Amino acid sequence: SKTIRSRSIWDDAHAMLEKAKAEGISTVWDRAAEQTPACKFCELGTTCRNCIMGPCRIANRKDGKMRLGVCGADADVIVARNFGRFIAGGAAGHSDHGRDLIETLEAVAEGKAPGYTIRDVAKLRRIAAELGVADAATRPAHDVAADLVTICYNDFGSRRNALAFLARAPQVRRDLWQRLGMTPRGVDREIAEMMHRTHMGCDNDHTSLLVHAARTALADGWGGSMIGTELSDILFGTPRPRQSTVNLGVLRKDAVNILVHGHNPVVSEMILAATREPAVRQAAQDAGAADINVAGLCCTGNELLMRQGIPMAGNHLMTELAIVTGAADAIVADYQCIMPSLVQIAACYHTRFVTTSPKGRFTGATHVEVHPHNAQERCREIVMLAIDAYTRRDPARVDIPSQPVSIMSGFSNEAILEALGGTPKPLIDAVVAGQIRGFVGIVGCNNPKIRQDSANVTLTRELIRRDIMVLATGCVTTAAGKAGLLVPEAASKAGEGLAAVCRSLGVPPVLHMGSCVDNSRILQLCALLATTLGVDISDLPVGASSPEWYSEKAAAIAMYAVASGIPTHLGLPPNILGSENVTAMALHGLQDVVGAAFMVEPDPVKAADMLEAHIVARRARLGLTS
């Protein structure tokens, strides 16, 4: 099928799309076609529903009519408020994630979280000391955890002048944020202030709205997400390099297949632990399975990969196709980026669709709510549901289409520094010498507007060919992994300088750094490099790219990268092109404010050209002559 071929570059996606068509199962691609053409006002951002004097639409008419909303707001204000609420939704997605990790560490510190513990005590004491906990090196671990919990919760309060982890940013960058009124103060506060500013008759200046959009996103990258990453390492272990596999072939016909979907390792890590209990394994054996096979989807899959080496079944647009294999006995979901279509596709099979979060409710799902105090009991119950579902699997409808592809994961900053000998100097020396021209974080989603992973893979291949090391997070992990680029042998696909450094270190030219929350690791790495060199992040040869993004979370990441000084490419435009002034600020004006700007470019080769050009300009401003 030419239609099926154009929807993905991967054979496992093609096979399941053929199977879905034969069974009459509609997919995300089919509904994307139904929603094309899109509403032009919605696509341009020139529409507002923020009060019932409206709703309003804006046009650029020579007769002057419909230039303003009923309240008098123009296209610049309307577009900027819509973009601000878009970013606020993304920041909120990460904020609640981080909040749940604080709650879990608190429960551990109180001794009220059976099955949870502090699995990286050394990092707990290091992070606590970094953030000002007294005597963090020597006091009892649960006391230190309690004080760290208080620091993190206070960043979710309204009394700080700056978030705790913001101290990692170089002084020049913190001074810039302070002058601009961009310093993030509270993780929830900035989100709430964005919703206030975008109410009718509050903030009606597009520049002011975009500045607070930056502040809101910064409260994610340096707050909600960074707290989420660092406490996740403390509770579940700091990632270290390890081998795994990727694609739909990680599912096993002879096993109970449990797919974890969403973002919360507080659930997926306890699901994994339940599948390892002797009586649970025995129940699977008694049902006829060879054993129990946990496989990851989305960000929670990324995190199980980073910390446990659990193979990943696929990324965003693979999620429906994973069920169509007919071998998914249960989907265990928490929250964010979980398409509700999965509930209906699971209903075409035996698959149990289990929700676990009070925030991730799906009509028709089997809800087994998980909290730290009951997770060990509840996750055992969920695995037993999966084993029962396995007994009802129809063998005539099973088709697992591929052989899994080997990958290497686990490149936390701690792992990178260890591979470098303990200091960033060997990496800095390679950048100075020109063996590594720079670094690009490729961090985006999938989007039905783009042939799945075609841009993700092409950009990754282009950058490493040009001696630009790629840091991969989120959906891009599966893309690069299936492309064979997440292994040390992929140094053969890099340019001569990057290949030599990778082979000297024994690492791939593409480093898996985790989930979308773990883009905070990229912020930490940039801050460390800038601080070591005595410059701003906006002076580093770095970039970020989201070639196939779709979510509000992805836009929030892009915004906090830009606001932190990282040039950021998007494959597709946000819904802002109805305002030339807002668009010009995003693409150009922000350069003269925060030292970086957005780029929109659907050709991944041209995107590589633009990212390299920024890196070349940054190298020149550092005076590098190589």
Report the residue from 33, 38, 39, 70 that binds ligand SF4 according to the rule CB under 6 A: 70
Q: If binding is defined by CB under 6 A, does position 56 make contact with ligand SF4?
A: yes
Q: If binding is defined by CB under 6 A, does position 338 make contact with ligand SF4?
A: no
Report the residue from 7, 14, 85, 614 that binds a second copy according to the rule CB under 8 A: 85
For 176-186, b/e burial (b = at least 16 CB within 10 A) is bbeeeebbbbb
Q: If binding is defined by CB under 8 A, does position 161 make contact with a second copy?
A: no
Shortest Å, Cβ 74 to ligand FES? 16
Place of tokens 């103060």: 185
Report the residue from 186, 314, 508, 604 that binds a second copy according to the rule CB under 8 A: 186
Name which of residues 42 to 101 contact ligand FES (CB under 6 A).
42, 47, 57
- For residue 472, what is the enclosing H or E element? strand 468-473
Using the Cα atoms of residue 598, residue 601, residue 605 and residue 609 in order, give the sign of their dihedral. negative
Residues 6 or more apart whose CB falls under 8 angstroms from that of 606 comprise: none
Which one of the spans 35-43, 354-362, 489-497, 561-569 is the region binding ligand FES (CB under 6 A)? 35-43
Quick one: 32 or 283, whose CB is closer to ligand FES?
32
DSSP class of 39: P
Please state the φ and ψ torsions of residue 413, each to the nearest 5 degrees. -60, -35
Identity at 147, one-letter amino acid code: D
Quick one: 44 or 354, whose CB is closer to ligand FES?
44
The answer to whether residues 94 and 228 touch, using CB atoms and an 8 Å cutoff, is yes
Site size toward a second copy, by CB under 8 A: 100
CA R_g for the chain: 24
Q: If binding is defined by CB under 5 A, does position 178 make contact with Mg ion?
A: no
Quick one: 51 or 141, whose CB is closer to ligand SF4?
51
Q: Could you tell me the two tokens for 388? A: 């029962």
End-to-end CA gap in the chain = 49
Name which of residues 338 to 367 contact Cl ion (CB under 5 A).
none
Q: If binding is defined by CB under 5 A, does position 161 make contact with Cl ion?
A: yes
Report the residue from 93, 228, 241, 595 that binds a second copy according to the rule CB under 8 A: 93
Quick one: 138 or 161, whose CB is closer to a second copy?
161
Residue 488, helix vs strand vs coil: helix
Q: If binding is defined by CB under 6 A, does position 78 make contact with ligand SF4?
A: yes
Shortest Å, Cβ 573 to ligand FES? 16
Q: Could you tell me the two tokens for 331? A: 């989907």
Shortest Å, Cβ 412 to a second copy? 26
Query: 552, 230, 604, 583: which is closest to 412 by C-alpha?
Result: 230
Q: If binding is defined by CB under 5 A, does position 131 make contact with Cl ion?
A: no
Site string for Mg ion, 101-140 (x = CB under 5 A): ------x---------------------------------
CB burial of residue 316 (10 Å; 0-12, 13-18, 19+): buried
Residue nearest to ligand FES (CB): 39
Q: How far apart are CA 168 and CA 465, in angstroms?
A: 32
CB atoms inside a 10 Å sphere around CB 137: 11
Q: If binding is defined by CB under 6 A, does position 478 make contact with ligand FES?
A: no
The answer to whether residues 115 and 95 touch, using CB atoms and an 8 Å cutoff, is no
Binding-site annotation: residue ranges for Fe(3+): 516
Binding-site annotation: residue ranges: 39, 42, 47-48, 51, 56, 71, 263, 298-299, 337, 445, 475, 516, 551, 553
Binding-site annotation: residue ranges for [4Fe-4S] cluster: 39, 48, 51, 56, 71
